[PDB]
Amino acid sequence: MNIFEMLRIDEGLRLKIYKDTEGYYTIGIGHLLTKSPSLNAAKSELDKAIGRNCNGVITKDEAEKLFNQDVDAAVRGILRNAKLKPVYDSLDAVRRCAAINMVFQMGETGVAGFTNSLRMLQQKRWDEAAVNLAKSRWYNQTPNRAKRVITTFRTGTWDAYKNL
């Protein structure tokens, strides 16, 4: 398992514009297009992202390119963030993937707000971190995914993903 396989499981793959769990226009492997209710706005963002007139549909290669860019952006967001970088640097490789997963889903600023969880992770208090992480809108709104990510933080193993 690696971060690409992990997020591919969590986000799926759809080649036509769809709505994510929050009702936002998205495409590919969880590539958010816009939070605007306008499908036309989403199609414009798509065309800009891909560099051609897509009419709301992309190829698998294009989806994978956006995914590469998005994972890269998540990692860079972590490294540039004064709250996230020290925690990330303190983690082992598997737990780093859990961090990237969270940043991919909710953004750098969102994750940086998990102050108490971040401290517990930095302190390697895994069970306590897991308990704290679950006290969140994140967990309540996407519990199956949050549970997988949290199990990854708790154990430092891929146990929550391996069968998927």
Count of the separate structural domains present in the chain = 1
Residue 32 is labelled as binding a ligand = yes
Q: What is the DSSP letter of 59?
A: -
CATH of residue 82:
1.10.530.40
Please give the method by which this entry was determined. Answer: X-ray
List the catalytic residues.
Answer: 11, 20
Which tokens is 58 given?
Answer: 């992309």
Range of the domain at 116: 1-164
How far apart are the C-alpha atoms of 38 and 19, rounded to whole Å? 12
Which tokens is 40 given?
Answer: 């036309």
Residue partners of 79: CB distance under 8 A and separation at least 6: 85, 88
Resolution of this entry, Å: 1.5
> Hey, which bits of 57-139 come out as E strands?
none
Bridge partner residues of 28 (DSSP)? 14
Answer whether 4's CB lies under 8 Å from 67's CB: yes
Residue 132 is labelled as binding a ligand = yes
Residue partners of 10: CB distance under 8 A and separation at least 6: 30, 101, 105, 145, 148, 149
